[PDB]
Amino acid sequence: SHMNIQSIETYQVRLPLKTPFVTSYGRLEEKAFDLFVITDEQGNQGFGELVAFEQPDYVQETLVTERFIIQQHLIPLLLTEAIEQPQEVSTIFEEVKGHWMGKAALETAIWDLYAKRQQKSLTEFFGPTRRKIPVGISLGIQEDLPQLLKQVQLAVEKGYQRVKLKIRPGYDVEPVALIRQHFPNLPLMVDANSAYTLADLPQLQRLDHYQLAMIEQPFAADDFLDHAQLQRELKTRICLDENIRSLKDCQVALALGSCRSINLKIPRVGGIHEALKIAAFCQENDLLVWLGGMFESGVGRALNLQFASQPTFSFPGDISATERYFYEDIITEPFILEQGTMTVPQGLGIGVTLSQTNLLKYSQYQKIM
Amino acid sequence: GSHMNIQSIETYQVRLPLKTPFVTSYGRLEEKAFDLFVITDEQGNQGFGELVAFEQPDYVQETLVTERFIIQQHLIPLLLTEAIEQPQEVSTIFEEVKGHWMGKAALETAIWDLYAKRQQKSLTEFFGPTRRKIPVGISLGIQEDLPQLLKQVQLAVEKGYQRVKLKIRPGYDVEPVALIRQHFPNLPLMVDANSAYTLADLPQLQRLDHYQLAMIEQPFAADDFLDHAQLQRELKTRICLDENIRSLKDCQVALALGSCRSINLKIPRVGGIHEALKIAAFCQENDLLVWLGGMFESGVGRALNLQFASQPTFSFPGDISATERYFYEDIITEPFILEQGTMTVPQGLGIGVTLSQTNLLKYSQYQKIM
């Protein structure tokens, strides 16, 4: 009675955004994502989400291309061997190069399935975990400092224990100074989104005076050497994102001295097994690791909350209630956020149940096998 | 004005019959599929480029179908946003697209070809010093029957090849190498490890260090820099990286970690000619032996490979062969000349080839994108 996949179903969902995306390729009025439902011989069902964007701006994977790699190469690989432990999936997919998000979509669903098989919450496989966890908040560029200061104040009023400010060349030292002045002990970090170059090192060093938790990806998404040049000169921890796809990338960053913090995203790293290996390595080498979001639906969000609930993830991550980005979700229950703290879903697997009514109005169904 | 006004873009999805079908985890492939792109300006000049990506993501992540999609959905629209004057502008235009190196190169290489023709020059006139004819190497798979192996090496040498590449595996390395170095103590020989080894096999690889090998290619994982550096520090022989080198920055990291002393360069894998030129230069500046690898290109990609590899910096013969070595027929009108291990570099404007309308009709599906 080993895990014997009876069927695989998928929903191509398009969830309306409260704030549509503007990309170099056009506008996006909704976040598109594919859901995968893997049913075993027992009737148990594992849920997974393909979160890849519709354009290769953040990273190379896109929804349409990963969707193809899943049906043409990954699913066939997944269906050849009987799986005993979810950790075996990463090994099974090993022969497929790249396509991390496509792998994660299927791999995370197998972990969910396995958990349900054991009649346990997936959290039971992540070692010690919290029931509720503080989450951070991120503010975009606010040229009107007074209003920005207003935002931080409301953030603190709502109990958020950490704040992230997006930053760019002509907007960094001034706004960070203002917030550090009105909030001396507030955990603060900045997000440079690759907006700087090595020539801006002088400017970036000024931030060392404001006790920031970290400065995220100031240089190119594919750079290690420039970041190392900066990290050597900074007391503040530099954080990498796009560049960290696996345990080995963390090992290369550590070797080069590229950073002292890692932004971890399960889909970007290919799944839970890889995310777990990366988190363990960061713990052993003083690399502050935290979890980031990717506009996931409730399916991916549930998993993020559970994974981020481990004590290790002490720095509040980028996780919010689904309604922060959407009007509705495709799962039946809402996540509860009270004073910057969210409850970690309990219940078998990821602890969420699909909303057939909403899936019916926002998605296209298809039985792969 | 001196800008290339693109009037039309045409594509051909080709499937060229292989003399030896591919065997993949997804099935046998009787032909090498690839897409050709033709970019015509207002003067009637036409640039040719090729999308070489395999039909499965086993070598590298890109696949023919997915890159084909990225090209029409993202790259072509981007390509058409500026009135391009210099081919170097393409890689900058494409910079915002993450990854998709092979898709980028397909169009980027066509623009270089178009520009050269526009300037009334052979593409070689843009690669600095270049040779008219160049020696190419030969590859040889695993051969447990040493006697025959020695026979094939004897054949290659008799045929003029000045370098041989042997596929190697954990229980098959020193044996065939020692045999060849004993019968050809002066022949340039390299070994392709195809990521079949692990760091624990160090002692076995060290034994190879005493056969004057030009290099040992990617003994460890395709995405590894650190294990390779550990090995490299223990060997006199040059370690060569491939899958892992997508840009100049990747070479900079490899050099900083001491991962290798040689680079397998493939234009498609690197995103085009511009990045390839930056990589070759950095290699020449840092004593990294660079050579051109192959990807079963049709005559379009092959013509470019010969022209780029003709630069004297590419001292080590690369994996470039006549199209006949892998295919029955080609989609260009003329076969490449190969005499005693030496191939003729295409002269003529751009990459110097003309498409075979007859063969394109036999082996491809046409589509006018713009």
Looking up residue A214, the CATH number of its domain turns out to be: 3.20.20.120
Q: Give the separation between CA B184 and CA B171, rounded to whole angstroms.
A: 22
Q: How far is CA A39 from CA A4, A259, B179, in A?
A: 9, 41, 55
A68 and A153 housed in the same domain = no
Q: Give the separation between CA A304 and CA A181, rounded to whole angstroms.
A: 33
Closest CA to A311 of A284, A337, A290: A290
* H runs (alpha helix) in A166-246: 173-182, 201-205, 225-233
Burial class (CB in 10 A: 0-12, 13-18, 19+), A184: exposed
Give kind and range of the element (H or E) at residue B272. Answer: none
Q: Is B286 on the interface with A (CB under 8 A)?
A: no
Q: How far is CA B62 from CA B57, B59, B249, in A?
A: 6, 9, 20
A142 and A42 housed in the same domain = no
Phi, psi of B321 (to 5 degrees): -140, 175
Query: Cβ contact (<8 Å) for A256 and B257?
Result: yes
Nearest-5° angle of CA A288, CA A290, CA A294? 145
**Experimental determination technique:** X-ray
What's the first-to-final CA gap in chain A, in angstroms?
20
3 state SS of B81: coil
A296 and A307 housed in the same domain = yes
Q: How far is CA A256 from CA A220, A232, B225, B234, in A?
A: 16, 10, 11, 20
Q: Give the separation between CA B270 and CA B109, rounded to whole angstroms.
A: 11
Tell me what percent of chain A is helix, strand and coil, each rounded to the nearest 5: 35, 25, 40
Out of A60, A72, A224, name the one closest to residue B98 (CB). A60
Name the amino acid, one letter, at B89.
Answer: E
B65 CB neighbours in chain A (<8 A) are 68, 72
3 state SS of A59: coil
Closest CA to B165 of B143, B183, B147, B144: B143
A219 and A254 housed in the same domain = yes
B/e letters for B320-359, b = 16+ CB within 10 Å, e = fewer, are bbbbebbbebbbbeeebebeebbbebbeebbbbbebbeeb
A226 and A236 housed in the same domain = yes
Name the pairing type of β-strands B46-51 and B27-41.
antiparallel
Q: Give the separation between CA B353 and CA B338, rounded to whole angstroms.
A: 16
Number of residues that make up chain A: 369
DSSP state, residue B86: S
Q: Give the separation between CA B154 and CA A311, rounded to whole angstroms.
A: 65
Query: Cβ contact (<8 Å) for A60 and B100?
Result: yes
Please enumerate in sequence order all residues whose Cβ is within 8 A of that of B46, keeping only pairs 6 or more positions apart, or say none.
B38, B39, B40, B114, B117
Closest CA to A218 of A271, A259, A157, A279: A259
A292 and A353 housed in the same domain = no
Listed by the residue before each break, gaps in chain A with C–N over 2.5 Å are none
A277 and A154 housed in the same domain = yes
Q: How far is CA A267 from CA A48, A92, A222, A274, in A?
A: 10, 17, 18, 10
* H runs (alpha helix) in B97-191: 101-118, 146-159, 174-183
Query: Cβ contact (<8 Å) for A252 and B257?
Result: yes
Q: Is B73 on the interface with A (CB under 8 A)?
A: yes
Q: Give the separation between CA A174 and CA A210, rounded to whole angstroms.
A: 11
Please enumerate in sequence order all residues whose Cβ is within 8 A of that of A369, keeping only pairs 6 or more positions apart, or say none.
A7, A8, A75, A79
Q: Is B233 on the interface with A (CB under 8 A)?
A: no
Q: How far is A51 from chain B (nearest CA, A)?
A: 16
Q: Would residue B345 be called left, alpha or beta, if left means φ above 0 and alpha means ψ between -120 and 50 degrees?
A: beta
A203 and A134 housed in the same domain = yes
B265 and B279 housed in the same domain = yes
B104 and B200 housed in the same domain = no
Please enumerate in sequence order all residues whose Cβ is within 8 A of that of B176, keeping only pairs 6 or more positions apart, or say none.
B143, B146, B149, B166, B168
Closest CA to A90 of A82, A80, A100: A100
Task: Note the resolution in Å, 1 decimal.
Answer: 2.1
Structure tokens at B60: 């590298």
Q: Give the separation between CA B352 and CA B248, rounded to whole angstroms.
A: 28
Number of independent structural domains in chain B: 2
DSSP state, residue A21: E
Which residues constitute the domain of residue A281? 127-346
B186 and B86 housed in the same domain = no
Q: Would the CA dihedral through A240, A145, A135, A113 be positive or negative?
A: negative
A90 and A106 housed in the same domain = yes
Name the amino acid, one letter, at B223.
Answer: D
Name the pairing type of β-strands A26-40 and B364-368.
unpaired
Please enumerate in sequence order all residues whose Cβ is within 8 A of that of A199, keeping only pairs 6 or more positions apart, or say none.
none
* Spacing of C-alpha A96 from chain mean position: 22
Query: Cβ contact (<8 Å) for B61 and A97?
Result: yes
- Count of beta carbons in the 10 Å neighbourhood of residue B310: 23
Q: Is A59 on the interface with B (CB under 8 A)?
A: yes
Name the pairing type of β-strands A45-50 and B189-192.
unpaired
User: Where would I find the beta strands (DSSP E) of chain A?
Assistant: 5-23, 26-40, 45-50, 132-134, 137-139, 163-166, 188-191, 215-216, 238-240, 261-264, 288-291, 337-338, 341-343, 363-367
Q: Could you list the active site residues of B?
A: 167, 266
Structure tokens at B72: 């029409």
- Count of beta carbons in the 10 Å neighbourhood of residue A179: 21
B224 CB neighbours in chain A (<8 A) are 248
Please enumerate in sequence order all residues whose Cβ is within 8 A of that of B27, keeping only pairs 6 or more positions apart, or say none.
none
Closest CA to A14 of A321, A367, A335, A326: A326
CB A266 within 8 A of CB A108: yes
CB A353 within 8 A of CB A333: yes
Phi, psi of B354 (to 5 degrees): -125, 135
Please enumerate in sequence order all residues whose Cβ is within 8 A of that of B315, keeping only pairs 6 or more positions apart, or say none.
B289, B291
Q: How far is CA A70 from CA A88, A111, B56, in A?
A: 17, 17, 12
CB B274 within 8 A of CB B247: no
A225 CB neighbours in chain B (<8 A) are 249, 252-253, 256
Number of residues that make up chain B: 370
Name the amino acid, one letter, at A181.
Answer: Q
Query: Cβ contact (<8 Å) for B96 and A225?
Result: no
Q: Give the separation between CA A212 and CA A172, rounded to whole angstroms.
A: 12
- Least CA distance to B74: which residue of chain A? A25
The annotated binding site of A for Mg(2+) is made up of: 191, 216, 241
Query: Cβ contact (<8 Å) for B98 and A59?
Result: yes
Where do we find the tokens 């079908």? B21
CB B199 within 8 A of CB B229: no
CB A107 within 8 A of CB A93: yes
B222 CB neighbours in chain A (<8 A) are 97
To the question of whether residue B287 is assigned a binding role by annotation, the answer is: no
Phi, psi of A7 (to 5 degrees): -160, 160
- Least CA distance to A98: which residue of chain B? B61
Q: How far is B334 from chain A (nearest CA, A)?
A: 35
Name the amino acid, one letter, at A12.
Answer: Q
Nearest-5° angle of CA B65, CA B66, CA B68? 65
Structure tokens at B271: 């995103």
Please enumerate in sequence order all residues whose Cβ is within 8 A of that of B28, keeping only pairs 6 or more positions apart, or say none.
B21, B22
Q: How far is CA A54 from CA A161, A263, A354, B93, B95, in A?
A: 32, 22, 23, 19, 17
Q: Give the separation between CA B295 and CA B301, rounded to whole angstroms.
A: 9
Name the pairing type of β-strands A5-23 and A26-40.
antiparallel
Q: Give the separation between CA A2 and CA B261, rounded to whole angstroms.
A: 48
Closest CA to A111 of A49, A62, A32: A49
Query: Cβ contact (<8 Å) for A65 and B61?
Result: no
The annotated binding site of A is made up of: 191, 216, 241
Structure tokens at B284: 């020449």
Name the amino acid, one letter, at A140.
Answer: G
To the question of whether residue B192 is assigned a binding role by annotation, the answer is: yes
